[PDB]
Amino acid sequence: NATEIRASVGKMIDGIGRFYIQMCTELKLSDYEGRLIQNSLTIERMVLSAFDERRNKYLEEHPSAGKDPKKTGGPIYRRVDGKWRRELILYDKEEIRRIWRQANNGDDATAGLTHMMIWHSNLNDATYQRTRALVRTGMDPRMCSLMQGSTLPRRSGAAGAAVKGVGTMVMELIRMIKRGINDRNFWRGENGRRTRIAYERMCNILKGKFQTAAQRTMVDQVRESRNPGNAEFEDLIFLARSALILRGSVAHKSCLPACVYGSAVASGYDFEREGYSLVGIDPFRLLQNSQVYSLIRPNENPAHKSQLVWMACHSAAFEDLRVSSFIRGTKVVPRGKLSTRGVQIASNENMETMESSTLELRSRYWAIRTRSGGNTNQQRASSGQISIQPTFSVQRNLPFDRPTIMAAFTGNTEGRTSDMRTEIIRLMESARPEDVSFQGRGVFELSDEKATSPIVPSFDMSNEGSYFFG
Amino acid sequence: NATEIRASVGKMIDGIGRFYIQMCTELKLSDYEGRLIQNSLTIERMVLSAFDERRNKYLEEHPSAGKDPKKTGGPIYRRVDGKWRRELILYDKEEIRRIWRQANNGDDATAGLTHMMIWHSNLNDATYQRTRALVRTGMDPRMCSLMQGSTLPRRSGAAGAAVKGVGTMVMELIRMIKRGINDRNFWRGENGRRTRIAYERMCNILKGKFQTAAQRTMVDQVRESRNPGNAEFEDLIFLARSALILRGSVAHKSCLPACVYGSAVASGYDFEREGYSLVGIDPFRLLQNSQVYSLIRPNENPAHKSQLVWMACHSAAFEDLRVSSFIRGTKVVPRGKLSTRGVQIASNENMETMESSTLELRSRYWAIRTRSGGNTNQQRGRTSDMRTEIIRLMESARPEDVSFQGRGVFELSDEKATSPIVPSFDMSNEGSYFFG
Amino acid sequence: NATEIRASVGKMIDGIGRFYIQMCTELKLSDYEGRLIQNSLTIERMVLSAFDERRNKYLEEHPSAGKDPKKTGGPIYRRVDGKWRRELILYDKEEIRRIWRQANNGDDATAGLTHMMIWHSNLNDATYQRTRALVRTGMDPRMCSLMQGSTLPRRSGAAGAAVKGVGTMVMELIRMIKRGINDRNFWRGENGRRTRIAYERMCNILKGKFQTAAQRTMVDQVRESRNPGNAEFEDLIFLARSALILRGSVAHKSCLPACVYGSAVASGYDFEREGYSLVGIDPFRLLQNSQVYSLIRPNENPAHKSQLVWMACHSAAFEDLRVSSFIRGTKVVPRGKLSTRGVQIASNENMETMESSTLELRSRYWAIRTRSGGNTNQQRGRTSDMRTEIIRLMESARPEDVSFQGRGVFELSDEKATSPIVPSFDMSNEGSYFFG
Amino acid sequence: NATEIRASVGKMIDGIGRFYIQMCTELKLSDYEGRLIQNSLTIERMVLSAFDERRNKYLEEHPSAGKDPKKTGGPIYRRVDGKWRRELILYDKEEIRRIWRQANNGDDATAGLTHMMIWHSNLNDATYQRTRALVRTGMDPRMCSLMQGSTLPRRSGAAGAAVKGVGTMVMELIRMIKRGINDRNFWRGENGRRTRIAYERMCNILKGKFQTAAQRTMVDQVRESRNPGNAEFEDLIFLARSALILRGSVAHKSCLPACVYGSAVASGYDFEREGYSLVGIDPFRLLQNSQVYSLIRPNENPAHKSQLVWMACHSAAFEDLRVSSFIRGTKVVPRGKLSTRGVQIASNENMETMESSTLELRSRYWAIRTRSGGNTNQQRASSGQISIQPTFSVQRNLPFDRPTIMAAFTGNTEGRTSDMRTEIIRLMESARPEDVSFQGRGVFELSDEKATSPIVPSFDMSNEGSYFFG
RNA sequence: UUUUUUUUUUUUUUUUUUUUUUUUUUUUUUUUUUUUUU
RNA sequence: UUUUUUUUUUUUUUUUUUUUUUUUUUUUUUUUUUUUUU
Structure with a gap:
């Protein structure tokens, strides 16, 4: 209801x-x-x-x-x-x-x-964005678009956590990783346990924010490192530059x-x-x-x-x-x-x-402002059968999709950082600056109250510039 | 008779x-x-x-x-x-x-x-299959083919139990295992005894459904665990992906x-x-x-x-x-x-x-629809040791082995199964896969 | 100070x-x-x-x-x-x-x-001791001497915990063990976690109460059982009958x-x-x-x-x-x-x-009443291996070993513990046993 | 209430x-x-x-x-x-x-x-007692006094089980033992399980009927035999002739x-x-x-x-x-x-x-008819301390009752059939035909309703014969 | 020649998601200002 | 110099028992009668 x-x-x-x-x-x-x-x-x-x-x-x-x-x-x-x-x-x-x-x-x-604290974060994002901290962590200043909800501190609840951007979480996690690298802070004490807990809470917030399975799985894999060192830093930078196009569903x-x-x-x-x-x-x-x-x-x-x-x-x-x-x-x-x-x-x-x-x-x-993403990435492992069952007793072959049968059995588990970066690159190449998104939805007039009939906008005004910064 | x-x-x-x-x-x-x-x-x-x-x-x-x-x-x-x-x-x-x-x-x-309830299960399987629950238990959506008789509840008898698929039983048993993991439900009370009983009934239904001795033995040994925890979960997932090729004789x-x-x-x-x-x-x-x-x-x-x-x-x-x-x-x-x-x-x-x-x-x-398996199977301490023979049988398996030797498709005019006609398809790769 | x-x-x-x-x-x-x-x-x-x-x-x-x-x-x-x-x-x-x-x-x-609650426990121990509960748990009525502070409930603090006897703790822990055996009460819920916590608190109180290293180590190893069943019952009964002679330092x-x-x-x-x-x-x-x-x-x-x-x-x-x-x-x-x-x-x-x-x-x-043990102790894989040293220490123990060397009974007129008088009883076997 | x-x-x-x-x-x-x-x-x-x-x-x-x-x-x-x-x-x-x-x-x-079925059993016991079956099982005809409730079949409940005599239970159990000796009837089938169950039910009825600890313990020990053969026959005959004097509390x-x-x-x-x-x-x-x-x-x-x-x-x-x-x-x-x-x-x-x-x-x-026994057997291991605790810090010996300390530790368990028969014999020798029982209770008059004042009977009439049979 | 058991809240808006989703605290920072400087 | 946590019904008639305690069925027997006979 x-x-x-x-x-x-x-x-x-x-x-x-x-x-x-x-x-x-x-x-x-x-x-x-x-x-x-x-x-x-x-x-x-x-x-x-x-x-x-x-x-x-x-x-x-x-x-x-x-x-x-x-x-x-x-x-x-x-x-x-x-x-x-x-x-x-x-x-x-x-x-x-x-x-x-x-x-x-x-x-x-x-x-x-x-x-109110989110609205302060909104005004801060509208007015000034910090490439200062973005390069303090060393990340390039090209990703200013993912600083949504950056000023929000941890004290906010789930509603506050929903609107924080992917890059905000990346910055917050890199801060903790650098602090744990500077000093041996992950001991068996209560401080280590609590920072651990905050870490998985921020990480399942992250994996909830994403939409495609590959990035969710690689975020799952990133968790498997009990000692966050240097490799995870570039791992999550790759995650961020993948979310540049494979954007997360942020409200x-x-x-x-x-x-x-x-x-x-x-x-x-x-x-x-x-x-x-x-x-x-x-x-x-x-x-x-x-x-x-x-x-x-x-x-x-x-x-x-x-x-x-x-x-x-x-x-x-x-x-x-x-x-x-x-x-x-x-x-x-x-x-x-x-x-x-x-x-x-x-x-x-x-x-x-x-x-x-x-x-x-x-x-x-x-217009409505949903917490959804764009529709373009749709070409990989199309959900389908792998085996068949004989219904009629007919002298016929039983088609088995063998190369995926080995893949399921392989040996232990599956999924890596660079291995999945390969599909990241493939998907980025498949992505185009032409793919239209938000099919079936449109801009509405003020006089209507129940979302009856929209009007489809259409811009052909060259390259006025769809970039607020730069 | x-x-x-x-x-x-x-x-x-x-x-x-x-x-x-x-x-x-x-x-x-x-x-x-x-x-x-x-x-x-x-x-x-x-x-x-x-x-x-x-x-x-x-x-x-x-x-x-x-x-x-x-x-x-x-x-x-x-x-x-x-x-x-x-x-x-x-x-x-x-x-x-x-x-x-x-x-x-x-x-x-x-x-x-x-x-009638089986026929409702048949129409449900024909129309919609639930990868939703299949991934709710975490199992991959590659095995939609073993969701036969999934909608059938427990109340059906042996005749109903015969047509339920292997994957349906896997889902039903994982539900009970997850419920017993969430809370200490296997106590010496009557509820624990009755869920135990239903468990061995579903398990001997399972082992009756299979045909090769290795999977029957590993199902026998899965029973030896008095406290179903996490290891049995992957054990029976391995059982399921083995039944992908070593299919059970389901009517x-x-x-x-x-x-x-x-x-x-x-x-x-x-x-x-x-x-x-x-x-x-x-x-x-x-x-x-x-x-x-x-x-x-x-x-x-x-x-x-x-x-x-x-x-x-x-x-x-x-x-x-x-x-x-x-x-x-x-x-x-x-x-x-x-x-x-x-x-x-x-x-x-x-x-x-x-x-x-x-x-x-x-x-x-x-054509006749028997509760048998492909002829390919006839041509061929813990769970992992038997998983080894699972892997070697899977490697021995081929997508070429013809099955159902000695049986064929019949014409309508014949009533006593006199003479069949052998079908033969060479129409490339039209696609033998209803989903995907 | x-x-x-x-x-x-x-x-x-x-x-x-x-x-x-x-x-x-x-x-x-x-x-x-x-x-x-x-x-x-x-x-x-x-x-x-x-x-x-x-x-x-x-x-x-x-x-x-x-x-x-x-x-x-x-x-x-x-x-x-x-x-x-x-x-x-x-x-x-x-x-x-x-x-x-x-x-x-x-x-x-x-x-x-x-x-005050300890003093009520003292009067209760002086007047009536319960072999009723002692045999309700099945332990023999020979150990009535270790029912000190038995009536004390858990609500008392560390000062109250100091004076409770070893047998009182044995009874309290066996109650929890029998309750956890009757029903599957050790689940991952908050009740199981809290009874677990109370269990290690009572156990380190126990190991603090003892003096010799062997019983402390066997109490440490009794803890290693995550699921207290029946074996721990006789294990801690052996602990109790060892504390009969290897008494704990109870105030x-x-x-x-x-x-x-x-x-x-x-x-x-x-x-x-x-x-x-x-x-x-x-x-x-x-x-x-x-x-x-x-x-x-x-x-x-x-x-x-x-x-x-x-x-x-x-x-x-x-x-x-x-x-x-x-x-x-x-x-x-x-x-x-x-x-x-x-x-x-x-x-x-x-x-x-x-x-x-x-x-x-x-x-x-x-006389001074310290929370120490007899000088006789200073003169001297599983639980059974340590039970072996329990038996050999019991055999080494004698009903002759004099204890509390260097301390004596004092007169009323002295205030600073200056000079005691050494008592000496040769009055046969009048009976050093309040019960029986 | x-x-x-x-x-x-x-x-x-x-x-x-x-x-x-x-x-x-x-x-x-x-x-x-x-x-x-x-x-x-x-x-x-x-x-x-x-x-x-x-x-x-x-x-x-x-x-x-x-x-x-x-x-x-x-x-x-x-x-x-x-x-x-x-x-x-x-x-x-x-x-x-x-x-x-x-x-x-x-x-x-x-x-x-x-x-009603108990009252039929009462009239049967009053009229005729069967030494025929008592010697069919071979037990001597001296124990006709313990045939109370003999005619009662198993179908009666706990109330019926209370009034059946010790000898009746002895006869019923010997029947089952002889049947299990004649043929290998204790198999893992349902019949063996059910006769087993009836056996422990009759046995805890027995041990509830007795009063002294020694006979309860030996009945407990008799249970430890998973295969009732011949030794248990004389074991329970000894139990019966011990209950001759150490009578059970039967209602x-x-x-x-x-x-x-x-x-x-x-x-x-x-x-x-x-x-x-x-x-x-x-x-x-x-x-x-x-x-x-x-x-x-x-x-x-x-x-x-x-x-x-x-x-x-x-x-x-x-x-x-x-x-x-x-x-x-x-x-x-x-x-x-x-x-x-x-x-x-x-x-x-x-x-x-x-x-x-x-x-x-x-x-x-x-007079009141309670389900109690006579008071005479009261000399064995008087419940008392075995250890002492130092309250005052005084240079004194710590009295330990060593010979019972070994007895508790012994090795494994304790209690046997003949070992306990020894205390049976000792108690029988301690028993006398003079010990007066039922102290504090007496025979009452009809006119009183609330058990106010009794009159103490006293018989000095030689040896008229306190024996209904013989 | 192989069989009707019941235990604390689910499901026909629809075809592979969504689930009605939430106040934790650890040793010194920041409103002179908009992308550097400490 | 060592410490106030709460989970579904108990206890002061009293000092070592009692606990308000229960309808299961497996292949041929028994009322000529009271201690033998099959």
Whole structure:
């Protein structure tokens, strides 16, 4: 059943919106100031810093960074008669802990935490990607497309684990492998057992993420190494560059600004009654009647800022630019010529230059965002019979597929790293930049609610560039 | 003597046909509607749901699935002036229990039950095979050929046990082994004793099914493990992949549609007098003058549907395609390019698109279907030592060894197995593989 | 350092004595009634029934035994002008929980709980030993001497675990082994893991209790059996009958009546300041100026009752009678001819016959009670190979080997263990055996 | 609790009495004829022949003995104006089966069957004992005292098994041993397994019956012989002659004539309400107001017949004659000079000589009949310590009882047949014909109901003879 | 001439996947900024 | 200087027993009668 999931997510987002309402009440902010992305961003880093129970425990025993008992940051932006001023207001965690507890009807609301931290990961992926760490591990900077959910820490649950990219897992596992190579950390102690456990948990997340059997089997084989040394490093680099084309089925969770939920809840649009969805039309239509204000530099233009905000909201920064333009209806400028900077404001930037203005989020069309992959790799061992059974008593031969009969019996087991790299190469050669994907699905219009009739897009606009970076 | 067996099976099928006659009388169906496979299929799931005494006892204590006191399903298809309509008519078990009791002259007729449930297993094997469960147990999907009688539950008797495939038994035993591994279920209690008993019963069924001494001995030694753990899992997987070539002597019971028997009985062809057989010419000649109507989708073609129905009737879906074509006289299309779907109709499919038409069951020739193995086998401490002889026998095996010496395909006009004709195919590599 | 342990035990017993003072205040009992053992006994079963959190949780889900929400028993004995009357006054646990919490300065005082439950175990061992269970497990009734701390449940900590006898652990482990033999209880579930854990905890307690390397090694090897069946049963019976002579180093915790502590605390003798000890002179000198009243049957004599009470207080019921007589200065009658019964009074006994009188606890001498073994041990693939060395050590053992060299019995007037006097008994065979 | 057992036995005897009422109704017998022991005796052999399901199955496949489809015997005695006549009326089993089924409220009433068959065993033991079979097995005729419950077949349950004597079990086991010696009957077949099972069931019944540990252990040891040959024969004969003095705790079930229950039930004395007991005062007071008529030969005297009937009712034929006389208040004549014959009438005896008269069952006193033994054997291994533990740290010896320490360790196990016969002989020598038993219990008066105050009997009447046979 | 046993929740939307899927903590990092520098 | 874990019904009439204890069938016997006879 899907009604229960819809009711649960509706209750969750209703609690989130009511917490936004109460923060607006408590902060004594104006109507316009309640529609600013920066305030929600700072408040949500406060949120994560209050539920980072692991870091809370680590910092209680580590009283450093000067005045840091329980309070961090808090750069609240406020309006005086047109001008803007930032105040470093410090909030302790504990009162906000209870205000959450009262906001979700006595519950912890950790799922909502996962969605906000994923949405921060989405905005981070949209704005800046780290080839710095990608080459710190030595991997080439060609794979920036697989840094989805990179900023997400381990503390997130299965829902958070679903949206993390393959390359994010590759980076996380190489970090552990390099740490275990630097020092003899895999001893029989509890630390070794726990890092082992986290390792197989991340690995079965990986093998769940993939779709074709060959990569799943080679990930299974990679596990057989009890002592991760150097060979597994290139093994999993080969895994990553195979996933470049043999991409994993990674979900795309549609989270929206802290305000958008608050404005919707304030108007009385209860999500529990009519139901809510995270993949369907829902986050699209809530943005159809949403007003958002944002802060812009004197050199920054708002036209690219709105498009980057739409990137961050719908996590489409790693998609084809042409498709995003089609849903937008307007051309989406790649990051090469974006005359804008990061959404977040540096702590040293002055305030006389800063100017607030609206953001455009309206899109002409809407589409479903499933956690599926492209259809192209379909040529190997077609599932079929190997033996036959005599039904009629007729003097005839019994056809046996002998060369596979030896293959099943071989000797011990089967499957290797380079052996399977051979089929990786074969499949890559079979792959073409022409294979059309997502057959049977199309882009839909806003006026339709039940997915009745789509329109098939068709682009012949040469080589405008389907590459957000470079 | 063979006359007594023939008389018994003739009486049984006569009772079955008379029950078909009475259901036709009671359902107020027309002559054409009495020749529909779907009606017989639904009625026979009603049959199994009425004699599933174990499930009856389990569901009486488990009142779930909404309105389910005694009645399940019942999608009866009916004609209005060319068009078709399904009615969800619910029948309770008990009245049909007594109608059976009166249909077999006061007897339970459990053997007939076994043949109908086997025929459902035959149609299921013909239509869809489950690599889903085959890989749920982790076994590779290369052995779909040994899923014969897979849908058959344990409740069937020895006659039902004869036709179940080796792979079906492998799946059933691995299920029990995994259940005993998940929890400490082999205690000295009655449950452990009874599952133990069922285990040796299934195992001596297995060792009866095989023919060569080596596999019988290794099955004997697999029994010596009082605690089935993980090693026996690969042991019996090796047994299965050895039976891939060293196939077991599994019977092929020739059951026919619920209607075919009813039409034959209605015409007055008493089977007790002239005798009946389940392996010989009998089910062939009854189909020589049988008319069958069936329901077909607007995209489905009837040409492949008739061949699939012949598969289901004669359980030849696991045989060589070339031989089935020879008896048919027409080419039999493998499942790779069958532009058809399952015979059974989904509960949500609309009725304006559905169209009824005849099915062809005539075959140019007839052949005996014995429960023997290929002549190639006659030409040829732990489990691994015997695995060595398994490997050497597999190496000795060739894809050239001709089997079934001294037997041939026969013509319809002959009744006493007088003179056959030797077939000979040189048509390259058309493909002797129904799947793939 | 030993000062911290002395301060801790002094604080603990001071809290216990202050709780006794407050119960005397709250119960409105007279001065004489505050010196009765029966009242303290009933109050301390109330104590254990209030901290038996496991049983509290088990009984909250199990509302049986009629009126048993939170209150059990409570047979308070009171005096009217010489005569005696029992009232079944029921006290709930929770208020006494907070009165404890206020009695130990906001602490739970679980250690004191361990000492009171051990002292109940000491009195139980002094009064009655169960050959009933000893033969329920089938072990012979010759080993009644190793039933020390038998009544102690698992809930006690390491201090409680120290005083439990070897035979008590043998009984507890055989109970678990028989339970695991009756049903397949060692599955991979959490229950099996937890019983496994309790098993190695009890086993390393066992191997800590022993002194010679051979028995420690054979206990180590008994662990190697992942599935405890029947062989381990006789293996650990052999372990027990080896510990009959190769005794384990089991402590003897010197706990005293609930009143004795209360009278001492009431007089103002703070134990924190001057320090307190559980093994040294301390419990001896507190009894040198302690007055105790007790209830006696019209047929029971008080002379044997006082000696049995001294047994219960100092846990000397399993020691040689001659030594206990030497410290007493008077002959100690063995249980064979004790014309007395159990200290506790049956729920049906009438009250007109019951008579209260003093008890004598004065002893002429005092001695240290260490958790060591006899000096005789220092003078000296499977389980059977080590059983061979067990047999040869038993043969090397003699009933003549004198133990405890370098230590002696001391006089009361000395406080710092200056000069002892060596005892010497030549009084034939008076009988060094409390039972039989 | 004892109330439930009392209610169950009361319901059972109420059903029995109501069945007696209905048989009196159906047989068209007079009031006097309903108080005849012979009619109840014949009817109860009909009862056992109707529930002997094993024999029913054996005789259905064995149609012999002429006219014997379902009907056996049935010598009903009737009065014509003073004279007596027997009619061989044949009743089939099945209708009486349903009349029972309706008499116990839809139940089978097998327990009542056990009590009636035990009461037949009691009367048989009172009247005639078989030294014929006792010497057929070769055992001497000195042990006629242990033939209690000898006629009881195996079909009885645990309640029936409790009252069977030790010698009865000895005879039953020797029969099986001789059968297994004559032919190789202990094969691995089902028959051998089932006779094995019956063997250990009879043996743990035996070891439950005994009281002293030595005989229990030697019975345990006798079991260790997987192939019962000749040695076990003398082994169990030694067991029997040891039980001659070391008697087993065998119960004495107090069943009464078929009529006595019927007369009590007919008068309206419901046993369910006031409760009923099988060991206490109950069967005594029901006989205090019971009238019984019986058939007597022209040479037989009724005075000894009444005493023999009291023997049969209370199963006191194996007790001391002096005690039975004390409860009677009149001298009880031993079987040596009883000028009477068996209660049952031979099939050929004429009817002109037969005369009916009353029977006396009144007793001056009453006593409890427990399933306990005599107190005398109490001198062997007095349960006591073997080791000591040092409580005080004193320089002293550690007393160890070494000769028993070797005995526990010995080598393998311990206990034999002749080895234990040695302690049998020692105990027999310690036994005396003077040891008084049953201390703390006494004979009671009729007027008391709650066992308040007894009177101690004392006999100094020389050697009148405490031996019913000889 | 070879045979009707029952043990705690499954399945006809469909033909080779999906299963209604989840808050763990170990010795110093990061919002001056967008692909280097430590 | 060595430590509070919980898994389906027990126990203070009392000191070494008792445990509220149960319808299985395998090849020919027995009521002339009470200790022989086959």
